[PDB]
Design a protein around this ligand. Structure first.
Ligand SMILES: O[C@@H]1[C@@H](O)[C@H](O)OC[C@H]1O
Length: 792
């Protein structure tokens, strides 16, 4: 019915803006920005093979061209590149080709001589050294040379360059952070994390290097001096089982509370080519509305224009539960401020952003989010460490922000960290026993069993009749036979011929009988950083998740994914398999590149920005992996043992925000276990928490060929009855859904009364309600958006 232009040049520009807001300047003595007309020598072999993404499902976007850093600098017309040094690298690389693997964390560095380095210095004004790292799916990052540490030849390179150049810039082309101890010690003039910026990364990076854009990126994780300083390191890296003993004390929640001196760069840290002054302003609280309102003014007090981020933190009273010193509750990035100009920033913060989950009952409100009695102090500033008192208010009694239930609780006891108040008025870590679950799972499922809809194969309503409002969804679903029900819970793929070639899955109209009811085939495709088309078809490769999050700018993120929204329609992809939004529990997790933060509020807010983007033209995202997939090693069977409180405040919280702020209507579960069973068959996760408590209205799908089990039972890839009993609606994926290619147990379990028809009907109703609002339904109804690409 309607045509829309996808302007490719504006798509490039939107993505380019994200890159130039997401680079994080850590150190600078004034060597950056690069001066007009300067000649730069670029060191590091990885300069020729810019890491545009990490590896795995989320790093297989095909493109015709990648603008690396050298090319980005030449295109700027602000500097020139030393062409002799480039040719040394190019010629060396013909003998030492880029290893593709399985793909390694890094490439072997070219050894440098005194002659090469000395001659480059004579013919250039500044050295740029690029250190490259990638990482991803199934391969965790490791505390060794070539991975988290510099390799020996990389260190040599840096020391030579330092010696022969008095102007030296180090750039980290990395998916996740690496060791900064040796780099800091070598002490370059400027240090910037440039992440992996997709196919136009070099353009946006050139913008900040040349000063066309002033750096305004901030860290989404705390950088500590050693891997052993991180509170999760003790309990990370075990393929069988890991106890989340740090509990709520993840990242800056640990460091700012217990170990300030172990931090090199705090959460939210990043600098600019200008300087800013944050002046605390008016503060009011509204206890009856459960909000406070806080103002401050940010002023550019330096000599060049730039943006800054105002970050707001709450210190809750320790009470009986114990608390982190500071938790992030709001942030706002300024517009571009000219020298001597300023911007007033006001935030309204609901109490639920700094509530605590009582999993012991010590507050008198077990299984509730609560604010304990005491003094709440609010802080504003440039990062968590440099945040200063904005206001305060005191509660004489507990406030229950929300009543919940005992759900997804641990099945075995373990000791967790506890904030303990010393005689000094300081806080130390002590340990306490996590209570074990007393939930009767059998009874919970039976007491909440949905009502069966009597089947009726004569009255043949269409899914169009449900969409129009002509009939109830219940009235429609009655025509599905047991074959139809068994079939509709199966995703078909990879590369099902019902949808665009080379994508992840088709679902909904996966049989002739389902298609006859006007259930369309809905197409899923990886990934957060752009469409992965295994046909070889090209698509936009966008910056990695961590770079997105480092913008601290929901609007710039949403703008870019508004273009992705149209591109998906163009390719007839309805469901992009992102955002990835598992918490950065440990820096060594391989997939941190396509996730956002150690902080759940930032995590959810960035995820929600992406989803709003995709929703612009009616496309959609699938939040993943729900939940606690914070480790790649052992991910087919690993058991994350974690408290309710840690789940409610940290790991689930981002996903909750995705539902309630982001309008998320599609979730993906994990390959692994949380509290002693696989996530795909967990009732508490997929029904109790997600639907009954949060009000999610949508679909849940498995991760691709994930295992499912009943608690205590053996894991398999075809226990779909366990999956449907949990209200995980879709098994992803089978070669042929109509033929039950996986030989699943849906019908045999239904035959034996161990699976109720009502449970199948519930899943089928979720699938159909989702499917009828997709662009694939619009194509059947002939009221879809037609997209045309301009600017190529
Ligand atoms: O993240 C998912 C990954 O775990 C799986 O292997 O492929 C599908 C992706 O969406």
């Amino acid at each position: 019915i309607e045509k829309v232009i996808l302007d490719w040049n504006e798509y490039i520009e939107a993505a380019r803006s994200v890159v130039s807001e997401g680079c994080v300047l850590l150190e600078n003595n004034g060597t950056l920005p690069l001066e007009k007309g300067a000649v730069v020598s670029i060191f590091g072999r990885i300069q020729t093979h810019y890491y545009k993404s990490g590896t795995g499902s989320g790093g297989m976007v095909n493109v015709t061209h990648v603008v690396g850093v050298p090319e980005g600098l030449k295109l700027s017309e602000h500097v020139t590149v030393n062409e002799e040094l480039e040719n040394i690298y190019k010629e060396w690389e013909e003998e030492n080709p880029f290893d593709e693997g399985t793909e390694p964390w890094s490439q072997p560095e070219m050894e440098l001589t005194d002659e090469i380095v000395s001659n480059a210095s004579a013919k250039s004004d500044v050295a740029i050294v690029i250190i490259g790292r990638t990482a991803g799916e199934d391969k965790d990052f490791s505390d060794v040379a070539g991975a988290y540490k510099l390799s020996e030849t990389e260190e040599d390179m840096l020391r030579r360059v330092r010696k022969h150049f008095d102007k030296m810039v180090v750039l980290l082309n990395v998916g996740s952070l690496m060791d900064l101890n040796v780099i800091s010690e070598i002490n370059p003039d400027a240090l910037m994390v440039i992440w992996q910026g997709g196919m136009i990364g070099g353009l946006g990076t050139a913008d900040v290097l040349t000063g066309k854009v002033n750096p305004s990126g901030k860290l989404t994780d705390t950088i500590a001096y050693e891997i052993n300083d991180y509170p999760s390191t003790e309990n990370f890296g075990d393929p069988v089982r890991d106890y989340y003993a740090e509990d709520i004390y993840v990242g800056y929640r640990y460091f700012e509370t217990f170990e300030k001196s172990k931090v090199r760069y705090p959460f939210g840290y990043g600098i600019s080519y200008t300087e800013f002054e944050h002046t605390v302003g008016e503060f009011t609280a509204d206890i009856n509305s459960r909000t406070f309102t806080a103002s401050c003014t940010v002023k550019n007090t330096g000599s060049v224009a730039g943006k800054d981020v105002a970050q707001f933190y709450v210190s809750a009273p320790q009470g009986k539960l114990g608390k982190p010193e500071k938790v992030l509750v709001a942030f706002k990035k300024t517009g571009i401020l000219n020298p001597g100009k300023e911007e007033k920033i006001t935030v309204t913060v609901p109490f639920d952003r700094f509530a605590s989950f009582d999993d012991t009952g010590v507050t008198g409100a077990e299984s509730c989010f609560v604010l304990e009695a005491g003094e709440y102090t609010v802080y504003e500033g440039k990062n968590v460490r440099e945040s200063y008192k904005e206001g305060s208010f005191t509660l004489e009694e507990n406030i229950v922000t929300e009543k919940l239930s005992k759900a997804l609780a641990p099945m075995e006891s373990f000791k967790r960290m506890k904030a303990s108040e010393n005689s000094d008025g300081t806080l130390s870590v002590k340990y306490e026993d996590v209570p074990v679950s007393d939930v009767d799972e059998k009874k919970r499922r039976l007491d909440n069993m949905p009502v069966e809809i009597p089947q009726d194969f004569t009255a043949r309503y269409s899914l169009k009749d449900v969409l129009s409002g002509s009939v109830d969804m219940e009235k429609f679903i009655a025509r599905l036979s047991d074959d139809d029900l068994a079939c509709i819970v199966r995703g078909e793929g990879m590369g099902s011929s019902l949808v665009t070639a080379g994508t992840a899955a088709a679902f909904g109209g996966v049989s002739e009988y389902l298609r006859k009811m006007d259930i369309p085939a809905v197409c899923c495709d990886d990934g957060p950083s752009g469409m992965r088309l295994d046909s070889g078809a090209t698509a936009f490769s966008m910056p990695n998740g961590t770079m997105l999050a480092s913008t601290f700018n929901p609007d710039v993120i949403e703008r870019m994914y508004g273009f992705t929204s149209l591109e998906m329609i163009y390719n007839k992809v309805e469901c992009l398999l992102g955002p990835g939004m598992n918490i950065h529990r440990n820096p060594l997790n391989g997939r941190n590149f396509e996730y956002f933060s150690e902080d759940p509020y930032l995590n959810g807010t960035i995820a929600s920005a992406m989803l709003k983007g995709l929703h612009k033209y009616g496309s959609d995202g699938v939040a993943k992996h729900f939940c606690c997939n914070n480790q790649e090693l052992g991910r087919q069977a690993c058991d994350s043992v974690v408290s309710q409180r840690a789940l409610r405040e940290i790991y689930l919280k981002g996903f909750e925000i995705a539902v309630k702020e982001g309008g998320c209507k599609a979730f993906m579960t994990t390959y692994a276990q949380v509290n002693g069973m696989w996530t795909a068959g967990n009732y508490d996760l997929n029904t109790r928490i997600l639907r009954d408590e949060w009000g999610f209205k949508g679909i849940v799908m498995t991760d691709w060929w994930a295992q499912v089990n009943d608690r205590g039972g053996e894991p398999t890839k075809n226990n779909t009855a366990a999956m449907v009993r949990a209200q995980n609606d879709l098994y992803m994926v089978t070669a042929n859904a109509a033929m039950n290619s996986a030989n699943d147990n849906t019908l045999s379990q239904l035959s034996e009364g161990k699976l109720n028809r009502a449970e199948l009907q519930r899943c089928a109703m979720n699938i159909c309600e989702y499917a009828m609002n997709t662009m694939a339904m619009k194509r059947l109804c002939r009221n879809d958006i037609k997209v045309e690409i301009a600017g190529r």
